[PDB]
From a paper:
Recent studies identified two synergistic enzymes from Flavonifractor plautii, namely, N-acetylgalactosamine deacetylase (FpGalNAcDeAc) and galactosaminidase (FpGalNase), which efficiently convert A-type RBCs to O-type by removing A antigens. In this study, we investigated two enzymes from Flavonifractor plautii, N-acetylgalactosamine deacetylase (FpGalNAcDeAc) and galactosaminidase (FpGalNase), which demonstrate synergistic activity in efficiently converting A-type RBCs to O-type. O-type RBCs lack immunodominant sugars found in A (α-N-acetylgalactosamine) and B antigen (galactose), making them essential in emergencies and when matching blood types is not feasible.
Structural similarity analysis using the Dali tool revealed that each domain exhibits a structure similar to α-galactosidase, despite low sequence identity. Site-directed mutagenesis of D463A, Y464A, C513A, and D532A confirmed the functional importance of these residues, as mutations led to significant reductions in conversion activity, with D463A, C513A, and D532A nearly inactive, and the mutants were unable to convert A-type RBCs to O-type in samples from healthy donors. Moreover, comparison between the experimental structure and the AlphaFold-predicted structure revealed a significant deviation in the region from D559 to W564 in the catalytic pocket, highlighting the critical role of experimental data in refining structural models. Sequencing analysis of FpGalNAcDeAc and FpGalNase revealed three mutations in each protein, including V284A in FpGalNAcDeAc and P566L in FpGalNase, located within their catalytic domains.
Residue numbers in the entry: 44 to 701
The structure:
């Protein structure tokens, strides 16, 4: 009982009721998971472990969700509860290493109450001393939980992490665990948001990844579908798993922006207005335009403090005493100096003391007790800055968002918007809205994002749209309507670099991604291929450094290059590495300041991805020095010592150097 579509091989054992996963390399296969159970519901606080195999049927040539492939069905029966389980696994020929899972439950005797459903449990095989994991998250601590974590296998303790997707958690519903040989990625398969758990558990000698959904009462004689999930068995690191997941979900209607439709203003260097904090004035920004124009900045954004209240989105009289005239003047100055203008924005907010709530209570979300609800911070808390949420199924909220977009784009003059400081939508209990379920409000933020982006596009084909789910991984269902992605206020440099790699995997090689500006890491911004942006009012030696690195970024242009991340593996390679291709010439970035993963000694450096039949000269462009020469593409090994970083490029040479 086995199927194998492309790059995978799933086998089922009738006697033990276990599933084993493989991955194809060369002409053979590599084991990637030890035998694992199928999974079942949680009845009475304990998972049912009385399921008995009935029959298994395998179909060799079927068409399914992702196209042509294979499918086999497993039917099991439980005597204690009377439930009947049907398990369906699907693979496709075109897609490499993706498995589709579907579950259905039927109650034949009497009512069965289920508190949680469990499927697709897989345990890693071949682990030796450590396992690196990717966590979709959504509920973790805001600014201090890395999206990539290490599971040490020599520790006394154990590592467990439950990545939730609920009313207080909105992020990518994907988790991945990998070792040097490869890894396994499990993620949701749904075109719209729902409730899904992606736990990562450390076992006695390995780690586990799983999928889970909430349950409800199953009536007698009724068939209910629980959920669906995607399993990715890949070689390498989380980049391959995320890329496979994106390719798989491209078949469910979730399609990311194409490289030929991203506006050219997305790649331009940007300067935030955080230099003076909340005490900024129009005159200061106007007077700071000449220096940035000389340096090479081609984008200016307006941050917090310009509005009176959220929802109303009226101009603050303190910052704009003359009204729309001042905004037009600032926009005209920015345009005259050859730059575009953006605006700060909190999409789903509606305020607490705003006129929108004072005059129109009926567009907001109602709690269980009959009171307005507030936007939740990750975990379930409340921040004073955040206000009441706006129900997506009320026409007033959509009308207000469109009105604000049109007013900003046609009256004041602005070429884009910056979404910030919002995470999730609470449940609504208002009977007037006629909600089918209280969760209907939580599953429809994509409607607000889509409507706002449609208005923006209708006003101008080339627009800037970025959302900051600051602290946590960004909402997956807001991705199709963006043009740039940030790293959501990373705390350390390793965080922003790893998140840049992950978002390149999810989005695409050419998608604009920035490395944020919380701390000065120009090296990591340039080396990873991100967009260099700044917030401060710099003067002196740091000002000279800022201009120098702006010039380097302008003369290299790695933000418009192609990102390659499948060659090397993170956590099982001598250095933390990132590869960018620009006009044929390959660029490399090696790092050592990644406190999470830094090596001892000075290991040799191997450049892979080069033509074997070509001779290359390796020259650093930061200092204009030839580190190595006469290096054939096959060997491509040279020994060098550096403190923190090493940025190099492979310049082709027709004849050997002297």
């Amino acid at each position: 009982y086995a199927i194998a579509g492309n790059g995978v091989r799933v086998t089922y054992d009738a006697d033990g009721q276990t599933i084993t996963l493989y991955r194809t390399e060369g002409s053979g296969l590599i084991q990637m998971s030890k035998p694992s159970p199928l999974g079942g519901p949680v009845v009475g606080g304990q998972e049912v472990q009385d399921f008995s195999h009935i029959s298994c049927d395998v179909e060799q040539s079927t068409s399914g969700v992702m196209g042509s492939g294979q499918r086999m069905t497993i039917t099991s029966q439980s005597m204690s509860t009377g439930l009947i389980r049907t398990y369906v696994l699907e693979t496709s020929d075109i897609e490499e290493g993706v498995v589709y899972t579907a579950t259905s439950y039927e109650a034949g005797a009497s009512d069965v109450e289920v508190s949680w459903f469990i499927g697709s449990v897989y345990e890693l095989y071949g682990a030796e001393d450590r396992i690196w994991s990717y966590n979709g998250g959504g509920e973790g601590p805001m600014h201090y939980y890395d999206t990539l974590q290490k599971i040490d296998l020599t520790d006394s303790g154990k590592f467990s992490r439950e990545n939730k997707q609920d009313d207080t958690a909105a992020s990518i519903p994907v988790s991945d665990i990998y070792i040097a040989d490869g890894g396994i990625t499990v993620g949701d398969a749904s075109a719209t948001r729902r409730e899904v758990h992606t736990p990562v558990q450390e076992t006695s000698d390995s780690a586990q990844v799983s999928i889970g959904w909430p349950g409800k009462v199953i009536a007698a004689g009724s068939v209910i579908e629980i959920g669906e999930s995607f399993a990715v068995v890949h070689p390498g690191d989380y980049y391959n798993g995320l890329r496979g997941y994106k390719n798989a979900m491209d078949h469910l209607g979730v399609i990311m922006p194409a490289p030929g439709d991203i506006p050219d203003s997305s790649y331009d260097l940007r300067w935030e207005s955080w230099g003076w904090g909340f005490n900024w004035t129009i005159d200061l920004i106007i007077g700071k335009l000449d220096e940035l124009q000389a340096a090479g900045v081609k984008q200016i954004t307006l941050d917090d403090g310009w509005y009176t209240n959220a929802g109303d989105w009226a101009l603050n009289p303190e910052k704009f005493p003359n009204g729309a005239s001042d905004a037009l003047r600032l926009t005209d100055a920015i345009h005259e100096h050859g730059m575009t203008a953006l605006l700060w924005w909190r999409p789903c907010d509606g305020g607490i003391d705003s006129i929108l709530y004072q005059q129109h209570p009926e567009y907001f979300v109602m709690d269980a007790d009959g009171r307005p609800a507030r936007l939740p911070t990750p975990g379930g808390g409340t921040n004073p800055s955040l206000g009441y949420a706006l129900c997506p199924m009320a026409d007033g909220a959509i009308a207000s968002q469109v009105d604000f977009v049109n007013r900003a784009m046609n009256d004041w003059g602005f070429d884009g918007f910056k979404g910030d400081y919002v995470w999730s939508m609470p449940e609504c209990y208002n009977p007037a809205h006629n909600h089918a379920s209280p969760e209907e409000s939580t599953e429809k933020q994509s409607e607000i994002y889509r409507v706002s982006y449609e208005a923006m596009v209708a006003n101008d084909p080339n627009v800037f749209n970025l959302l900051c789910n600051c602290g946590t991984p960004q909402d997956y269902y807001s991705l199709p309507y963006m043009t740039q992605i940030a790293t959501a206020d990373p705390t350390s440099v390793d965080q922003t670099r790893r998140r840049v790699k992950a978002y390149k995997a999810l989005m695409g090689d050419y998608f604009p991604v920035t490395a944020d500006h919380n701390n000065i890491w120009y090296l990591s911004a340039v080396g990873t291929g991100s967009v260099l942006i700044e917030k401060r009012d710099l003067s002196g030696t740091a000002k000279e450094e800022y201009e120098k690195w702006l010039g380097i970024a302008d003369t290299v242009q790695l933000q418009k290059g192609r990102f390659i991340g499948d060659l090397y593996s993170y956590g099982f390679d001598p250095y933390e590495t990132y590869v960018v291709e620009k006009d044929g010439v390959m660029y490399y970035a090696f790092y050592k300041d990644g406190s999470k993963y830094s090596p001892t000694g000075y290991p040799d450096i191997e450049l892979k991805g080069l033509d074997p039949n070509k001779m290359y000269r390796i020259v650093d462009y930061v200092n204009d020095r030839v580190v190595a020469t006469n290096l054939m593409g096959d060997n491509a090994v040279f020994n060098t010592r550096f403190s923190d970083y090493l940025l190099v490029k492979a310049v082709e040479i027709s004849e050997p150097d002297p």
